[PDB]
Amino acid sequence: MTTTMKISIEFLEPFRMTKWQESTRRNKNNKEFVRGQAFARWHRNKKDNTKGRPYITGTLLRSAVIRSAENLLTLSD
RNA sequence: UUGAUGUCACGGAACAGGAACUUGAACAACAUCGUUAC
């Protein structure tokens, strides 16, 4: 019914990560959740204990692919 | 550990001001050590 395509990205430069926020101040009114939306995120299991790993939102990769498609469709009319 | 119809964060130089400085003839004469004797 569905087909899975596994991808992997590899960096050539030191990337940048954002801070950890709480589940309350995670809306459009906080000025630290915005301005940190184009970076990687830090997920910590069992909150109130800084122990976890980084990850990357899939919506950000979707937006980048959309921008690349917009820029590639204007070259072939 | 995201949710979708809308992310210019490669949109932003850790930058800007503060004398390791001040003072000094490579020169020269009087002793050191304690007890003996009635």
GROMACS .gro file of C-alpha atoms (C1' of nucleotides) in nm:
model
  115
    1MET     CA    1   0.000   0.000   0.000
    2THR     CA    2   0.289   0.234   0.081
    3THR     CA    3   0.654   0.237  -0.025
    4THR     CA    4   0.934   0.336   0.213
    5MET     CA    5   1.238   0.526   0.084
    6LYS     CA    6   1.517   0.557   0.339
    7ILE     CA    7   1.734   0.869   0.319
    8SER     CA    8   2.046   0.984   0.499
    9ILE     CA    9   2.203   1.328   0.520
   10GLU     CA   10   2.568   1.405   0.589
   11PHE     CA   11   2.706   1.739   0.706
   12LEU     CA   12   3.018   1.921   0.587
   13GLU     CA   13   3.010   2.197   0.848
   14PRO     CA   14   2.935   2.246   1.220
   15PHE     CA   15   2.560   2.275   1.244
   16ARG     CA   16   2.364   2.470   1.502
   17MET     CA   17   2.109   2.359   1.761
   18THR     CA   18   1.849   2.539   1.970
   19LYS     CA   19   1.761   2.527   2.339
   20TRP     CA   20   1.508   2.312   2.526
   21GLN     CA   21   1.167   2.464   2.599
   22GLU     CA   22   0.870   2.337   2.796
   23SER     CA   23   0.540   2.213   2.661
   24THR     CA   24   0.357   2.531   2.763
   25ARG     CA   25   0.567   2.805   2.600
   26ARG     CA   26   0.569   2.638   2.259
   27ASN     CA   27   0.337   2.864   2.061
   28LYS     CA   28   0.357   3.166   1.832
   29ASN     CA   29   0.382   3.409   2.124
   30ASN     CA   30   0.722   3.294   2.253
   31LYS     CA   31   1.019   3.463   2.088
   32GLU     CA   32   1.258   3.176   2.161
   33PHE     CA   33   1.056   2.899   2.000
   34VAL     CA   34   1.047   3.111   1.689
   35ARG     CA   35   1.394   3.217   1.566
   36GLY     CA   36   1.494   2.867   1.666
   37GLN     CA   37   1.277   2.690   1.413
   38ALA     CA   38   1.541   2.654   1.140
   39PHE     CA   39   1.778   2.459   1.368
   40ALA     CA   40   1.803   2.108   1.506
   41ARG     CA   41   1.617   2.012   1.823
   42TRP     CA   42   1.720   1.844   2.148
   43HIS     CA   43   1.487   1.576   2.283
   44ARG     CA   44   1.532   1.457   2.641
   45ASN     CA   45   1.339   1.161   2.777
   46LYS     CA   46   1.219   1.183   3.136
   47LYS     CA   47   1.204   1.564   3.160
   48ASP     CA   48   1.373   1.758   3.445
   49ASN     CA   49   1.684   1.555   3.365
   50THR     CA   50   1.909   1.686   3.087
   51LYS     CA   51   1.975   1.352   2.919
   52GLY     CA   52   1.875   1.284   2.561
   53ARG     CA   53   1.980   1.319   2.198
   54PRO     CA   54   1.937   1.559   1.904
   55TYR     CA   55   1.697   1.519   1.614
   56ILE     CA   56   1.568   1.707   1.309
   57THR     CA   57   1.205   1.791   1.237
   58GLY     CA   58   1.070   1.640   0.917
   59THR     CA   59   0.864   1.950   0.841
   60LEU     CA   60   1.184   2.151   0.799
   61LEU     CA   61   1.315   1.908   0.538
   62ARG     CA   62   0.977   1.922   0.367
   63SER     CA   63   0.998   2.301   0.343
   64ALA     CA   64   1.350   2.283   0.201
   65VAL     CA   65   1.242   2.031  -0.063
   66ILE     CA   66   0.949   2.254  -0.158
   67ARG     CA   67   1.181   2.552  -0.204
   68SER     CA   68   1.417   2.347  -0.420
   69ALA     CA   69   1.128   2.226  -0.636
   70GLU     CA   70   1.003   2.582  -0.681
   71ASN     CA   71   1.350   2.685  -0.792
   72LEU     CA   72   1.388   2.386  -1.025
   73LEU     CA   73   1.052   2.423  -1.200
   74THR     CA   74   1.131   2.776  -1.317
   75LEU     CA   75   1.435   2.658  -1.514
   76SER     CA   76   1.237   2.420  -1.737
   77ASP     CA   77   0.935   2.652  -1.777
   78U      C1'   78   1.067   1.302   1.841
   79U      C1'   79   0.733   1.702   1.385
   80G      C1'   80   0.223   1.741   1.102
   81A      C1'   81   0.133   1.934   0.612
   82U      C1'   82  -0.172   2.438   0.167
   83G      C1'   83   0.265   2.932   0.372
   84U      C1'   84   1.003   2.873   0.761
   85C      C1'   85   1.444   3.476   0.309
   86A      C1'   86   1.765   3.268   0.988
   87C      C1'   87   2.361   3.171   0.430
   88G      C1'   88   1.821   3.800   0.798
   89G      C1'   89   2.270   3.949   1.247
   90A      C1'   90   3.150   4.043   1.240
   91A      C1'   91   3.136   3.919   2.014
   92C      C1'   92   3.256   4.412   1.819
   93A      C1'   93   3.427   4.888   2.071
   94G      C1'   94   3.856   5.228   2.474
   95G      C1'   95   4.367   5.112   2.819
   96A      C1'   96   5.249   5.255   2.716
   97A      C1'   97   5.462   4.608   3.191
   98C      C1'   98   5.578   5.145   3.367
   99U      C1'   99   5.864   5.353   3.828
  100U      C1'  100   6.312   5.348   4.197
  101G      C1'  101   6.911   5.118   4.259
  102A      C1'  102   7.768   5.382   4.095
  103A      C1'  103   7.943   4.580   4.060
  104C      C1'  104   8.115   4.857   4.547
  105A      C1'  105   8.435   4.792   4.969
  106A      C1'  106   8.952   4.776   5.642
  107C      C1'  107   8.943   4.661   6.144
  108A      C1'  108   8.998   4.268   6.405
  109U      C1'  109   8.796   3.732   6.532
  110C      C1'  110   8.797   3.378   7.011
  111G      C1'  111   8.732   3.306   7.536
  112U      C1'  112   8.901   3.315   8.024
  113U      C1'  113   9.361   3.300   8.364
  114A      C1'  114   9.536   3.446   8.864
  115C      C1'  115   9.501   3.513   9.391
   0.00000   0.00000   0.00000
